């Protein structure tokens, strides 16, 4: 039969996750949309980074969610979006995480410079250079996501490999290569940049206390530190189970895979990817809570 590819997650849990996804879609899409409109100097250079983040969030909510919600949560087989939709999906997902992880570190660097060397940053990097750096990050992010264009692909996992219902989107490379391509992503998009940003966020948090006479600059910095602090924490917590599941996918041996671990993996998949869409919806919520100037103008642009 062609039931060997059926994923047996109960109907109730599917509805539960769908309700969560749809809610995070509404919160996330609206959140990041009027965030871009709100953004449209140092307060302004930071605007390009926040704008770059909101873009990486809109892409994953508009393009990745409706694809995943259909072919990964409800209808597991067959894959309906072609080979390009298979390769482009995992490409877009990896590229955005790199873009986000690099933006956080970039903000951590620039915020450090705004506190420790405010005169060195007085003759700051031109609006043009910051925009070039935003573009460079995106392109570098795409280069790092290249392996996904070759690691992923369409396979027919039916009995004889002939039945259309067995056409699924799955890694098409050997298990050894897959471990390597997953490791590189886990290191470069998660472990490495977050460890750096955490160290920077530790230094800034201490340096800020050390510093504490014309403008209300110190209030703006405090906003800058705590938002960034929350973003790093929110990024780590959300993406940690995600990377574990991917390692779990390829490091568990074939003789080790039972019917329990199979079903556990797919319920785990729901939770890990739910936190992914939380990560792409939390930022506009974070901006509103702390910055008093931003939240009111946010709601004013929301009515408009």
């Amino acid at each position: 039969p062609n039931s060997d590819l059926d994923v047996n997650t109960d109907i109730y849990s599917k509805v539960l996750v769908t309700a969560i996804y749809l809610a995070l879609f509404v919160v996330g899409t609206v959140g990041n949309s009027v965030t871009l409109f709100t953004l449209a100097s140092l307060q302004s250079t930071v605007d390009y980074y926040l704008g770059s983040l909101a873009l990486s969030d809109l892409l994953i909510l508009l393009l990745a969610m409706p694809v995943e919600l259909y072919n990964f949560i409800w209808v597991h087989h067959p894959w309906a979006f072609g080979d390009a939709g298979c390769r482009g999906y995992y490409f877009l997902r990896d590229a955005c995480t790199y873009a986000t992880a690099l933006n956080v570190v970039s903000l951590s660097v620039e915020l450090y410079l705004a506190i420790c060397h405010p005169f060195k940053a007085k003759t700051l990097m031109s609006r043009s250079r910051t925009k070039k750096f935003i573009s460079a990050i995106w392109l570098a992010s795409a280069l790092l996501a290249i392996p996904m264009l070759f690691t992923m692909g369409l396979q027919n996992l039916s009995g004889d490999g002939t039945h259309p219902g067995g056409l699924v989107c799955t890694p098409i490379v050997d298990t050894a290569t897959l471990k390597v391509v997953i490791q590189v992503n886990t290191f470069m998009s998660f472990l490495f940049p977050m460890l750096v940003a955490s160290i920077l966020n530790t230094v800034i948090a201490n340096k800020l206390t050390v510093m504490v006479t014309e403008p209300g600059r110190v209030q703006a910095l405090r906003r800058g530190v705590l938002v960034l602090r929350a973003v790093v924490i929110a990024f780590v917590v959300c993406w940690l189970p995600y990377h574990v599941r991917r390692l779990m996918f390829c490091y568990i041996s074939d003789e080790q895979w039972t019917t329990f671990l199979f079903d556990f993996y797919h319920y785990f998949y729901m939770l890990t990817n739910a936190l992914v869409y939380v990560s792409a919806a939390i930022n506009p919520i974070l901006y509103n809570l702390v910055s008093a100037n931003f939240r009111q103008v946010f709601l004013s642009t929301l009515a408009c």
Partner: peptide, 8 residues
């Protein structure tokens, strides 16, 4: 021994 997930 048993089934392995094909979804990543």
């Amino acid at each position: 021994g048993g089934r392995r997930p094909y979804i990543l």
